[PDB]
Amino acid sequence: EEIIWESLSVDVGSQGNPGIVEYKGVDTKTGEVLFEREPIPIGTNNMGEFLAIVHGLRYLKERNSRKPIYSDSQTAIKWVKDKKAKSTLVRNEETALIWKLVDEAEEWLNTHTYETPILKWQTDKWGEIKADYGR
RNA sequence: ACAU
DNA sequence: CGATGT
Ligand SMILES: [K+]
Ligand SMILES: [K+]
Ligand SMILES: [Mg+2]
Ligand SMILES: [Mg+2]
Numbered sequence: 001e002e003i004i005w006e007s008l009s010v011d012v013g014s015q016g017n018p019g020i021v022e023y024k025g026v027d028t029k030t031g032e033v034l035f036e037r038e039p040i041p042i043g044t045n046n047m048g049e050f051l052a053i054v055h056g057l058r059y060l061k062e063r064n065s066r067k068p069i070y071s072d073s074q075t076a077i078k079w080v081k082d083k084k085a086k087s088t089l090v091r092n093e094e095t096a097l098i099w100k101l102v103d104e105a106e107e108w109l110n111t112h113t114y115e116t117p118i119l120k121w122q123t124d125k126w127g128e129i130k131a132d133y134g135r
Numbered sequence: 136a137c138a139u
Numbered sequence: 140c141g142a143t144g145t
Contacts, residue, residue, distance in 0.1 A: 012139085016141095016142085017139095017141085017142045017143060018142075018143085019142095044142080044143055044144085045139060045142080045143055045144085046139075046143055046144055047143090049139075049143095049144095072138075072139065073138065073139055073144085074137070074138040074139075074144080074145065075138070075139070075143075075144045075145065076138095076139090076144090077138095078144090078145070079144095086144080086145090087143080087144085088143070088144080089143085120138085123138085123139090
């Protein structure tokens with residue numbers, strides 16, 4: 001603790017894993033939805049969590065905001081730190097879209113800078129992250 | 136085991 | 140119960 005309330009919180013929602021993947025970002029304090037990604041027909045939970053963080057980085061940079069990002073995903077936080085999404089999802093025609101988005105997110109990380117702190121939301125202490133889908 |  | 144990840 002404590003929660004940094006001046007922050008952006010992201011989370012993934014899916015129908016199956018692998019399955020339909022979406023994500024959203026919210027104001028941690030107010031719950032206002034700041035962005036939502038159109039559902040992607042096939043992806044994994046961790047790919048979605050990764051895309052959500054990267055989108056948050058791009059969203060905050062475009063707005064000249066120094067707020068941190070919260071995610072509850074140990075995996076996605078590490079993938080962003082590494083600039084490399086180490087997903088096991090097969091590459092085929094069905095997964096082409098999510099893989100294109102992941103490749104492009106990595107490419108963005110490798111061509112841009114940011115100071116945005118990427119923080120672990122401590123679900124065991126604080127309850128569900130504010131961007132949670134409730135599924 | 137931990138995080139989803 | 141299954142799956143994605145470190
Ligand atoms: K949920
Ligand atoms: K496991
Ligand atoms: Mg999550
Ligand atoms: Mg959730």
